[PDB]
């Protein structure tokens, strides 16, 4: 549907996005993904309304990428979110909006620190140790604030995401088809599949 | 006698930049084109200014669409704008009428483009600061007149020729076309005629890295002959004069 | 100008005098044409003076 | 308030033959229940053995016959007295309709003529854009009356050979120019007695390899 | 002298010289002869090739279903004004359902050439058209001068050696007005008119381009073997 | 309406119906829902008829000026991505769209894209779009096979539209199948649905809820 | 003669005869007299076919 | 139309900008004007000049109020001053009286009118303005301050200076008579004394236009009872009042 | 503005183009030689003037993408105007058709920019000439093009542009063989370095070499590596 | 005619070259001297006014030191009026990059933007150049202190030490003989006063003709502090170095 989650752990940002797209009264792809690289250590998962998601994903991509060749300097994940928000705010005021919610998870090279930013369609960034969007967000939150410790290793953040997933299968009134997880480490952006 | 305009006359009555523009077609490198009954042949002296030049990826023949091809001579940067417009133009007509545009009608569009310098006046929005100085040999095939070959000038006037040369070797080339041409020649005998007249005004050596042939046939559309066929054909000219 | 074509002929022999050749070659006239025509085209009277003619 | 589209009824019928083509229509113009005009053509010749009718709402329907003939003109001017094909004209009509798509026309267009093979060809457009080639397509308000009776006498639609009970379908045949006069006149005879936007007059244009013939028949006078 | 550079600078002789210069484009141009009766107008143009391999350049442009024009100046200049005349002929049929009067069409033409000659960064149009047509007061022959000036004549010429043509028309002046209904005779009277503007170039089935318009004949261009009866 | 396409080992089978209704009234039974964009692309017709018919002739205009400039044949992914950005502009003017651009190239393999009015673009392996896209999925997805012959696939495309056509109000007329190969689309012609049906009722022995 | 002065018009008379003189004629012909108008005038580079 | 979009100030070949150099010639043709900065006021001074005595001097103005806290006085061309005074009032309201609600500081307003200068040392179809202005004023954080805005478009802060045809002689007199405590009343005695040596024509309280930017007068405020605001600091001296201080030489 | 600054000459030219060509010669010198599997654009860098930084002072060769490098000779001021457009067109390519640029395409676009400024009212044309080089994506044929102020581009097997370009190109006719490129990448560095030390001279402190290998490998050599190739060549010679 | 009065500021000469950019630089050689030295613990910026007078207020003047943003100040040498415009542009652009990325603008970005602006006027518009020369002192985390000079051509070059304005040849030679890589701000303070002392045209150098500012990382909490020294501290530091 529209489920994107963020779990910031102390060495990795773990963004996972949905494998289902629903347009019309049936599922058209049940094997899909919904994430675009910004930087080689900045990852943006996006989800929300019909057809704003792709077109606003690639717009922002052209832009961060332009800078990053030009100056052969990565941006801070902090920098990156400011730009995305700047664009989102502006579109409410302009004729045609973009209703899309984005989690930008990156690993800063300067400070050596994960940072997770949650930007809503209105355009407010806010730094979080963990964050979600939609109604999916409700189920998940209450688990993260019980069991989270800010001293986590990579694997601990993965095993936590299993609880969140297990909960979602039960309560969620709709299908979503598992998630591709992506780990934004300091070496690359490496993909693993959760079971 | 005077020239401190941009679009001005001339005691004679021609436009002035246009007069100069035609004399920069004497600094082209040849495009020759014989139209016969079975098709139109276009050949060009490709030119190499150094042998550290890759001369097989510089080409001065360009396909406008399947059934209209073109050979360009004069300054090729000017030719970059007009050939784009031409591509665009042909496409528009297939859009609007789902019909393969006539050659004449195509030529006529591109002449209207060559006159559009000025400081912004008339009904045609000036945006050029000086006119083009490239001439085109619009080749092509229509289902109304068969095979046709046009010579488009940077004046803005277009004539259908049966054979024409343009470039630095024009004078010495069209003096020969006059004598040697007749009403009907079969297509591979046209290709050899292109290579014979291209050879007299040649300032190099006739070989396949500095001559390019191309045809237009109805059945095959516009095909630019590979170096394998251009080489063979060259060899059959040095053989055929060798029986004379 | 017919005056440039004179400079061409004089410089075609000047390259023979320099090469120790006594009878001209097509090669000596090519050298001549490049130096006289390319070099002195910057200094061409043709361009400025044509504006009156 | 301004409600800028009305209607003027009318009914038209296009039949593609095999050496001729038939584009016909009635000549009655209406607004509501009052008869405005008994006689008023809608089936205009455009030359080049194309007949067009842009039928429905009249004010749109005259606009696309104006704008259409204007392009027949400007084609003949810039292509050295070129003969306008059915193919060319069709795709051009498509552009003229489609260009207003934020304020559409509200007419049903149909063209007819010969194609380039010496057979009839009829293309029929919806107001928005698209088109397809036909052998019958009615339009207008008594469309749904006239179409299914033409599919049963031309294409032999759901008829089988006598006493074969579903084994072999009935064979198609060629219809003469003469026969097709009877089919079109008979449809509108039946149409008048069951519909109240058709009558007074019927103007068939028949297109051949010699010219266009108008042939005028009366219908019931209500 | 210094007065010749632009289109804004008068001129001590009362002139402007550039319009004067554009009038010499008509003179270096090829001949076309017009003559009219009281029922048919004729343009008799002599077409011009460059070389033997060359085609001949169309000199008569059918402007409408009852109008035709012929150039005797710049070919690019003629293309601009011809569109403008078609445009105003089609705007009259659309808006007022009226065949554009011949007398009115010289005034519409007029002002398009004046407004680029009064303006800076423009130029005059160096082409003269002879415009025939048959409207509601009959046949008309207009001569459009690149000066902007329109005049209405019974027969005229422009081109090179054109004066020799005006004379043929000047002699045969009281004859041709009185032959009506017989387009054969007007055409022949116009072929002979343009033949005194020769000087070893002749006339053939690829030189002569005739177009007529009649009361009883809409606009027809004859060429090919259809000008082979009328040499 | 119901138009489906599936990649298998030969290329993509495209399969379309020809019934274009106005609602209760059936407008025409011979409406082509295949659009030859060039010789290596076909586009299906779904949603607004007019919108798809127009813009995919006009994609043909951008296919031929891609082809000329690069002197190389267009990518299927590039083709899709022209069209996408065009319908994004006219979104909120409310023009409806449903197209599958189907192509097969030699530098990417068989690739389907589904271009939609939203700006939504999804590549894939099976799609069905229409007002009877639900019927079609059922048969096609059970009997799915990657490793399939050209002969079996042609019968499978037919059969899928058939099932949809029988229950769907707005499906019928005739079906038309194309098989897109590398070297071009090959047309497999026109089969009536109402005549296909009785053949397939005897041979298979399907439809025991249908009189006969 | 259009904007010729009476000195220019004297010039056309002499010029006409010179052209006859070359042909070798014993009279000046009408053909030659017009030819002399065109020779008195500076424009005598004539057509280039950009007036066709 | 307009086709003049090319600058008529162009680089001269041995360096310098030729129009701005020329325009400074036109500054030194005109009247003589001076300003003295005290510790509590600034005085500015100029001489009136007419075609004949038939002109009135009463309706003439050469010292203008741009804001109540900032006045200007020129030496150079009459026409150019006249429009540039009006453009100065305009940008002073539009860019600080609608944005920060109050009159702008003297440093800021000076900086805006130097940018008005600048966009006629550049752009097409324009030459430089032919005035040099003293723009004296008072702001709350740089004190009393006197500036000289010039045809170049530069500004210089000053403590006393002179511009106009008697500029050379005036400033030497003023260099030697300056002191690091002056009162505003003591400032006046300098400025009058200097302006008397640059006049050779008639000398009166009607032909010397004198202005002080002293300290606040609530009698020109127009109203009473908001104590937050404090009346015109700018105050042009009437002919009667100037005449006493003339006798005081 | 709207006045022409490029106008037709009574000869057959435009004086602003001939002039612009004169402008490329008064610039510094960039050399191009491609190996079997490398491009090498090396450029002469100034150091008449001293106390000049090395880290923060821009280089002569500016990476457009990860696989297309551009070098320029002529006015060092103008250069940055052609490159700003060229970088944005590359990202537009990625957007609208997908795939990153092909070297032929970027060269044709860059040519179209200079082409336009030779014929648009109120511009002079650029006095700057490029060696635009790189790899096609998913291929490994080296591509080396050079475009010039006319707005004309040429592909070259090896080429050289800037001051004394005729003197350097003469050298390259005699040592680079069209048939057999330098057998490895390393042999190709020794050729570009061998060429430069003719005109540039004055140590290895002026020589810059950017080497590209296929699959998006851009490396710009350090002063130490340069010294090493100059020394070998000096000694062998 | 309008064309009659056009300068044509922006064609080339026969040399290949731009008269009006060359002349612009001619006039900046008249203007005030400004030198910048990048120490390894600061940048010292010092410029000597081209005019002086004793009635001239020179105590709160800052007509050579202008701050662009919190971490980047420039020294000005040229047409001050032209510079005031681009200083106020620069200030708009620097603040802009901070608004949209929430990140301190790098020295490289602001310097390149200003260069291209100058560059627009020599390229097109038919307008005179902006004759300004900036020395940029700036800090960024990335490359530490960065030092830069820009010319009217709209070209930027890095420096470690540089001098623009009057007496460029003289100042440049002096810096080079003294400059070491191991220098802190104290050595830099001494050199900046000292080169200015050798190029001076006054009988002795004094504080009222010096404007002087530094940017030190040696300010508290590992922060860059921009200090434009007051003329009474400049007079103090002038007693220390024993110039007076």
Measured distance CA(E202)–CA(J231) in Å, rounded: 97
Contact J50, J155 (CB under 8 A): no
Report the number of distinct structural domains present in chain J. 1
Measured distance CA(F117)–CA(D124) in Å, rounded: 26
**CA dist A132 → A35, A92, A168 (Å):** 15, 22, 13
- DSSP state at residue H13: B
Q: Is E76 on the interface with B (CB under 8 A)?
A: yes
Cβ contact G42–B11 (<8 Å): yes
Cβ contact I124–J10 (<8 Å): yes
Measured distance CA(D108)–CA(D42) in Å, rounded: 12
Q: Structure tokens of H51?
A: 């075609």
DSSP A2-45: --EEEEEEBTEEEEEEES-EEETTEEEESS---EEEEETTEEEE
Measured distance CA(B160)–CA(B103) in Å, rounded: 10
Query: Is F3 an annotated catalytic residue?
Result: no
Closest CA to I131 of I200, I192, I41: I41
State the best of D79, D80, D83, D96 to mutate against chain B, taking most chain B CBs within 10 Å: D79
Element (H, E) at I165: helix I165-175
Number of other residues whose CB lies within 10 A of the CB of residue I171: 17
Measured distance CA(J174)–CA(J159) in Å, rounded: 15
Q: Structure tokens of I76?
A: 């060092």
Report the number of distinct structural domains present in chain H. 1
Which residues of chain D are within 8 Å of residue F54 when distances are taken between CB atoms?
94, 98, 129-130
Cβ contact G51–E199 (<8 Å): no
| SS percent in chain H: helix, strand, coil, step 5 | 30, 25, 45
CATH number at residue H201: 3.60.20.10
Q: Tally B–C CB contacts below 8 A.
A: 4
Burial of E11 (0-12, 13-18, 19+ CB in 10 A): middle
Q: Is I180 on the interface with H (CB under 8 A)?
A: no
State the best of E57, E91, E93 to mutate against chain D, taking most chain D CBs within 10 Å: E93
Contact J224, J216 (CB under 8 A): yes
Encode B182-220: b = buried (16+ Cβ within 10 Å), e = exposed.
Answer: eeebebeebbbbbbebbbebeeeeeebbbbbbbbbeeee
Q: Tally E–J CB contacts below 8 A.
A: 7
Method: cryo-EM
User: 3-state secondary structure string, J141-198?
Assistant: CCCEEEEEEECCCCCEEEECEEEECCCHHHHHHHHHHHCCCCCCHHHHHHHHHHHHHH
Q: What are chain D's domains?
A: 1-222 (3.60.20.10)
Number of other residues whose CB lies within 10 A of the CB of residue B54: 19
Measured distance CA(J78)–CA(J85) in Å, rounded: 13
| SS percent in chain I: helix, strand, coil, step 5 | 35, 25, 40
Measured distance CA(D79)–CA(B4) in Å, rounded: 39
Q: Structure tokens of E1?
A: 């002298």
**CA dist B210 → B43, B50, F64 (Å):** 11, 11, 30
Cβ contact J103–A82 (<8 Å): yes
Chain B residues whose C-beta is within 8 A of a chain G C-beta are: 11-14, 18, 155, 157
Contact E42, E34 (CB under 8 A): yes
Domain that holds residue J197: 1-244
Alpha-carbon Rg for chain D, nearest whole angstrom, is: 18
Tokens 């709160």 belong to J60
Contact F176, F32 (CB under 8 A): yes
Ramachandran angles phi, psi of F150, nearest 5°: -65, -45
Cβ contact B102–D79 (<8 Å): yes
Measured distance CA(G11)–CA(G5) in Å, rounded: 10
Strands B134-142 and B146-152: antiparallel
- DSSP state at residue H35: E
Measured distance CA(I14)–CA(I8) in Å, rounded: 5
Smallest Cα distance from I95 to chain F, Å: 8
DSSP F127-169: EEEETTHHHHHHHHHHS--SS--HHHHHHHHHHHHHHHHHH-S
What residues form DSSP beta bridges with H210?
H45
Which residues of chain H are within 8 Å of residue E121 when distances are taken between CB atoms?
3
Domain that holds residue H196: 1-249
Number of other residues whose CB lies within 10 A of the CB of residue E231: 13
Cβ contact E90–D70 (<8 Å): yes
Smallest Cα distance from I3 to chain B, Å: 7
Experimental resolution (Å): 4.1
Cβ contact B128–I115 (<8 Å): no
Ramachandran angles phi, psi of A45, nearest 5°: -100, 145
Measured distance CA(D111)–CA(D133) in Å, rounded: 10
Tokens 């559009």 belong to B116
Q: What are chain F's domains?
A: 1-212 (3.60.20.10)
Measured distance CA(A123)–CA(I233) in Å, rounded: 61
Beginning with the edge strand found earlier in the chain, give each strand of the sheet holding F34-38 in spatial order. Answer: F34-38, F41-44, F98-105, F109-116, F121-124
Which residues of chain B are within 8 Å of residue J3 when distances are taken between CB atoms?
4-6
Number of other residues whose CB lies within 10 A of the CB of residue J230: 12
CATH number at residue J79: 3.60.20.10
Q: Tell me if F164 is assigned to a ligand binding site.
A: no
| Minimum CA–CA partner of J2 in chain E | E120
List, in order, residues 6 or more apart from B205 with CB less than 8 Å away. none
State the best of D77, D80, D81, D82 to mutate against chain E, taking most chain E CBs within 10 Å: D77
Smallest Cα distance from B12 to chain G, Å: 6
Half-sphere exposure of F28 (CA within 13 A, CB side): 20
Instruction: Say if F and D touch: at least 3 Cβ pairs within 8 Å.
Output: yes
Cβ contact I11–B23 (<8 Å): yes
Measured distance CA(I118)–CA(I21) in Å, rounded: 12
Smallest Cα distance from C51 to chain B, Å: 6
Measured distance CA(A115)–CA(A112) in Å, rounded: 10
Which residues of chain E are within 8 Å of residue D77 when distances are taken between CB atoms?
62, 86
**CA dist J79 → B205, H16, H130, J134 (Å):** 60, 9, 18, 11
**CA dist J27 → E195, H8, H14, H16, J172 (Å):** 72, 17, 8, 5, 19
Closest CA to J31 of J46, J45, J53, J48: J48
Contact J36, J138 (CB under 8 A): no
Which chains border F (3 or more CB–CB pairs < 8 Å)? A, B, D, I
Measured distance CA(J149)–CA(J136) in Å, rounded: 6
Residue in B8, B11, B164 closest to E53 by CB: B164
Measured distance CA(E2)–CA(E133) in Å, rounded: 42
Peptide bond into B10 cis (omega under 30): yes
- DSSP state at residue F173: S
| Minimum CA–CA partner of G31 in chain E | E199
**CA dist J179 → E228, J147, J172 (Å):** 97, 15, 11
∠D19-D25-D27 over CA atoms, to 5°? 145
């Amino acid at each position: 549907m529209d489920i994107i989650l963020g779990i910031r752990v102390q060495d990795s940002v773990i963004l996972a996005s949905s494998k289902a797209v629903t347009r019309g009264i049936s599922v058209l792809k049940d094997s899909d993904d919904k994430t675009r690289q910004l930087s080689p250590h900045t990852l943006m998962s996006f989800a929300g309304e019909a057809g704003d998601t792709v077109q606003f994903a690639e717009y922002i991509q052209a832009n961060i990428q332009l800078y990053s060749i030009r100056e052969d300097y990565e941006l801070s994940p902090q920098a990156v979110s400011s730009f995305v928000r700047q664009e989102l705010a502006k579109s409410i005021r302009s004729r045609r909006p973009y209703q899309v919610n984005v989690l930008i998870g990156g690993y800063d090279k300067k400070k050596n620190k994960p940072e997770l930013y949650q930007i809503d369609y209105l355009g407010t960034k806010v730094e979080l140790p963990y964050g979600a969007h939609g109604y999916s967000g409700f189920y998940t939150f209450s688990l993260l604030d019980h069991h989270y410790r800010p001293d986590m290793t990579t694997e601990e953040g993965l095993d936590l995401l299993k609880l969140c997933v297990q909960e979602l299968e039960k309560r969620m009134p709709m299908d979503f088809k598992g998630v591709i997880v992506k780990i934004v480490d300091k070496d690359g952006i490496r993909q693993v599949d959760d079971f | 006698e005077y020239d401190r305009g941009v679009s001005t006359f001339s005691p004679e009555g021609r436009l002035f930049q246009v007069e100069y523009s035609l004399e920069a077609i004497k600094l082209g490198s040849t495009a020759i084109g014989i139209a016969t009954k079975e098709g139109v042949v276009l050949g060009v002296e490709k030119r190499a200014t150094s042998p550290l030049l890759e001369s097989d990826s510089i080409e001065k023949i360009v396909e406008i669409d399947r059934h209209i091809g073109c050979a360009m001579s004069g300054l090729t940067a000017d030719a970059r704008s007009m050939i784009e417009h031409a591509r665009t133009a042909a496409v528009t007509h297939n859009l609007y009428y789902d019909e393969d545009i006539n050659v004449e009608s195509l030529t006529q569009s591109v002449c209207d483009l060559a006159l559009r310098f000025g400081e912004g006046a008339s009904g045609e929005e000036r945006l050029m600061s000086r006119p083009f100085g490239v001439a085109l040999l619009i080749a092509g095939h229509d289902a109304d007149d068969g095979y046709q070959l046009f010579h488009a000038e940077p004046s803005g006037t277009f004539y259908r020729y049966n054979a024409k040369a343009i470039g630095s070797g024009s004078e010495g080339a069209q003096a020969e076309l006059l004598n040697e041409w007749h009403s009907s020649l079969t297509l591979k005998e046209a290709e050899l005629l292109v290579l014979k007249i291209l050879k007299q005004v040649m300032e190099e050596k006739l070989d396949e890295n500095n001559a390019q042939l191309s045809c237009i046939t109805k059945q095959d559309g516009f095909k630019i002959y590979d170096n394998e066929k251009t080489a063979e054909l060259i060899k059959e000219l040095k053989e055929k004069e060798a029986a004379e | 100008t017919g005056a440039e074509l004179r400079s061409v002929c004089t410089e075609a022999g000047m390259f023979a005098i320099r090469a120790r050749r006594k009878v001209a070659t097509e090669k000596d006239f090519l050298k001549a044409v490049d130096k006289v025509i390319s070099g002195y085209k910057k200094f061409s009277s043709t361009s400025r003076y044509m504006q009156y003619n | 308030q301004f409600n800028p589209y009305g209607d003027n009824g009318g009914t038209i019928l296009g039949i593609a033959g095999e050496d001729f083509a038939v584009l016909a229509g009635d000549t009655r113009n209406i607004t509501d229940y009052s008869i405005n005009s008994r006689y008023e053509p809608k089936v205009f010749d455009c030359g080049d053995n194309i007949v067009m009718s842009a039928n429905g709402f009249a004010a749109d329907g005259d606009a696309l016959v104006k704008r259409f003939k204007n392009s027949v003109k400007w084609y003949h001017f810039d292509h050295n007295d070129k003969k306008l094909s059915i193919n060319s004209a069709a795709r051009n009509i498509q552009h003229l309709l489609y260009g207003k798509r934020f304020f559409p026309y509200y007419v049903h267009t149909i063209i007819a003529g010969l194609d380039e093979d010496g057979k009839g060809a009829v293309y029929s457009f919806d107001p928005v854009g698209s088109y397809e080639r036909e052998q019958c397509r009615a339009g207008g308000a008594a469309a749904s009356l006239i179409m299914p009776f033409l599919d049963n006498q031309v294409n032999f639609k759901n008829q089988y050979e006598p006493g074969t009970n579903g084994k072999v379908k009935k064979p198609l045949k060629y219809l003469s120019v003469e026969e097709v006069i009877k089919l079109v006149r008979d449809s509108f005879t039946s149409a008048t007695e069951r519909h109240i936007q058709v009558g007074d007059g019927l103007e068939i244009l028949i297109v051949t390899k010699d010219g266009v013939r108008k042939e005028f028949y009366e219908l019931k006078r209500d | 002298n210094n007065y010749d550079g632009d289109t804004v600078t008068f001129s001590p002789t009362g002139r402007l010289f550039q319009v004067e210069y554009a009038l010499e484009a008509i003179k270096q141009g090829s001949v076309t002869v017009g003559l009219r009766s009281n029922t048919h107008a004729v343009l008799v143009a002599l077409k011009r090739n460059a070389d033997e391999l060359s085609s001949y350049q169309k000199k008569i442009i059918k402007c409408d279903e009852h109008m035709g024009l012929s150039l005797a100046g710049l070919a690019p200049d003629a293309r601009v004004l011809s569109n403008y005349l078609r445009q105003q002929c089609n705007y009259s049929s659309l808006v007022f359902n009226r065949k554009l009067a011949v007398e009115r069409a010289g005034h519409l033409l007029c002002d398009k050439a004046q407004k680029n000659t009064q303006s800076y960064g423009g130029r005059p149009y160096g082409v003269g058209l002879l415009i025939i047509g048959y409207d509601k007061s009959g046949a008309h022959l207009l001569e459009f001068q690149p000066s902007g000036n329109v005049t209405e004549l019974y027969g005229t010429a422009i081109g090179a050696r054109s004066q020799g043509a005006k004379t043929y028309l000047e002699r045969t002046l009281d004859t041709f007005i009185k032959i009506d209904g017989n387009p054969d005779e007007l055409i022949k009277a116009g072929v002979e008119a343009i033949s005194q503007s020769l000087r070893d170039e002749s006339l053939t089935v690829d030189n002569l381009s005739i177009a007529i318009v009649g009361k009883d004949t809409p606009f027809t261009i004859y060429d090919g073997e259809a000008v082979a009866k009328y040499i | 309406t119901t138009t489906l396409a599936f990649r298998f080992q030969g290329g993509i089978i495209v399969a379309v119906d020809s019934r274009a209704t106005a609602g209760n009234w059936v407008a025409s039974q011979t409406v082509k829902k295949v659009i030859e964009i060039n010789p290596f692309l076909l586009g299906t017709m779904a949603g607004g008829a007019a919108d798809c018919q127009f813009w995919e002739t006009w994609l043909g205009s951008q296919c031929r000026l891609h082809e000329l400039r690069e002197k190389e044949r267009i990518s299927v992914a590039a083709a899709s991505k022209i069209l996408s950005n065009l319908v994004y502009q006219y979104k909120g003017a409310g023009l409806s769209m449903g197209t599958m651009i189907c192509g097969y190239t030699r530098k990417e393999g068989p690739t389907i894209y589904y271009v939609d009015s939203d700006g939504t673009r999804l590549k894939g392996d099976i799609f069905c779009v229409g007002s009877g896209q639900t019927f079609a999925y059922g048969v096609l997805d059970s009997n799915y096979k990657w490793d399939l012959s050209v002969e079996d696939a042609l019968y499978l495309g037919k059969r899928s539209i058939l099932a949809a056509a029988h229950r769907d109000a707005y499906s019928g007329g005739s079906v038309n199948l194309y098989h897109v190969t590398e070297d071009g689309w090959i047309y497999h012609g026109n089969h009536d649905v109402g005549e296909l049906f009785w053949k397939v009722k005897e041979e298979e022995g399907s439809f025991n809820n249908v009189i006969g | 003669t259009d904007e010729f002065n009476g000195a220019q018009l004297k010039a056309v008379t002499v010029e006409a005869g010179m052209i006859a003189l070359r042909n070798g004629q014993s009279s000046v012909k009408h053909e030659d007299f017009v030819e002399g108008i065109s020779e008195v005038q500076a424009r005598k580079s004539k057509s280039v076919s950009f007036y066709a | 139309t307009d086709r003049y979009s090319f600058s008529l100030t162009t680089f001269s070949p041995s360096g310098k900008l030729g129009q701005i150099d020329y325009a400074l010639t036109a500054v030194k043709q005109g009247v003589t004007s001076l300003g003295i900065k005290a510790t509590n006021g600034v005085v500015i001074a100029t001489e009136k000049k007419s075609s004949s005595p038939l002109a009135m001097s009463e309706t003439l103005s050469k010292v203008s109020l741009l804001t109540p806290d900032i006045g200007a006085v020129y030496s150079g061309m009459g026409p150019d001053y006249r429009v540039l005074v009006d453009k100065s009032r305009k940008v002073a309201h539009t860019s600080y009286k609608r944005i920060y609600g109050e009159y702008p500081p003297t440093k800021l307003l000076v900086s805006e009118v130097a940018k008005i200068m600048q966009e006629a040392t550049q752009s097409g179809g324009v030459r430089p303005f032919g005035v040099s202005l003293l723009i004296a004023g008072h702001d709350e954080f740089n004190g009393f301050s006197l500036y000289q805005v010039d045809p170049s478009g530069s500004y210089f802060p000053w403590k006393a200076t002179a511009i106009g045809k008697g500029s050379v002689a005036a400033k030497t007199f003023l260099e030697k008579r300056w002191n690091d405590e002056l009162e505003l009343e003591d400032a006046i005695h300098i400025a009058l004394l200097t302006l008397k040596e640059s006049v050779e024509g008639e000398f009166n309280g009607d032909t010397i236009e004198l202005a002080i930017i002293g300290d606040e007068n609530p009698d020109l405020l127009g109203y009473t009872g908001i104590p937050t605001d404090k009346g015109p600091r700018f105050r042009k001296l009437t002919s009667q009042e100037i005449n006493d201080r003339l006798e005081a030489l | 503005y709207d006045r022409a600054l490029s106008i037709f000459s009574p000869d057959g030219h435009i004086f602003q183009v001939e002039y612009a060509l004169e402008a490329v010669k008064r610039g510094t010198c960039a050399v191009g030689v491609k190996g079997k599997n490398c491009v090498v654009l090396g450029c002469e860098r100034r150091s008449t003037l001293k106390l000049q930084d090395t880290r923060i002072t821009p280089s002569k060769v500016s990476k457009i993408d990860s696989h297309v490098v551009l070098s320029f000779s002529g006015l060092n001021a103008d250069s940055r105007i052609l490159i700003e457009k060229a970088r944005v067109e590359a990202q537009s390519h990625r957007l609208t058709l997908e795939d990153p640029v092909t070297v032929e395409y970027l060269t044709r676009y860059v040519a179209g920019v200079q082409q336009r400024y030779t014929q648009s009212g109120g511009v002079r044309p650029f006095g700057v000439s490029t060696l635009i080089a790189g790899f096609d994506p998913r291929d490994d044929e080296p591509k080396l093009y050079q475009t010039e102020p006319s707005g004309i581009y040429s592909s070259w097997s090896a080429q050289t542009i800037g001051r004394n370009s005729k003197t350097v190109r003469e050298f390259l006719e005699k040592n680079y063989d069209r048939k057999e490129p330098p057998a490895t990448v390393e042999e190709c560095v020794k050729l570009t370095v061998r060429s430069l030390l003719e005109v540039v001279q004055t140590g290895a402190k002026n020589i810059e070499i950017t080497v590209v290998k296929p699959d998006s490998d851009i490396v710009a050599l350090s002063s130490e590596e340069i010294n090493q190739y100059v020394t070998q060549i000096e000694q062998e010679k | 005619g309008s064309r009659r009065y056009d300068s044509r500021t922006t064609i080339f000469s026969p040399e290949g070259r731009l008269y009006q950019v060359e002349y612009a630089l001619e006039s900046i050689s008249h203007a005030g001297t400004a030198i910048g030295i990048m120490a390894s613990d600061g940048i010292v910026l010092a410029a000597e006014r081209k005019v002086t007078s004793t009635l001239l207020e020179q105590d709160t003047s800052t007509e050579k030191l202008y701050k662009l943003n919190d971490k980047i100040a420039v020294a000005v040498a040229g047409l001050t009026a032209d510079a005031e415009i681009l200083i106020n542009t620069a200030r708009i652009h620097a603040q802009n990059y901070l608004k949209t990325y929430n990140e301190d603008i790098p020295v490289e970005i602001l310097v390149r933007r200003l260069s291209d602006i100058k560059q627009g006027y020599t390229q097109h518009g038919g307008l005179r150049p902006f004759g300004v020369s900036f020395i940029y002192a700036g800090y960024d985390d990335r490359y530490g202190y960065q030092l830069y000079t820009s010319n009217p051509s709209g070209n930027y070059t890095g420096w470690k030490a540089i001098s623009v304005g009057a007496n460029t040849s003289a100042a440049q030679t002096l810096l080079q003989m003294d400059y070491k890589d191991d220098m802190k701000v104290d050595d830099a303070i001494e050199l900046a006063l000292k080169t200015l002392s050798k190029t001076t045209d006054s009988s002795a150098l004094t504080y009222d003709r010096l404007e002087f500012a530094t940017i030190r990382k040696g300010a508290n909490d590992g922060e860059v502090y921009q200090k434009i020294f007051k003329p009474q501290e400049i007079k103090d530091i002038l007693v220390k170095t024993g110039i007076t």
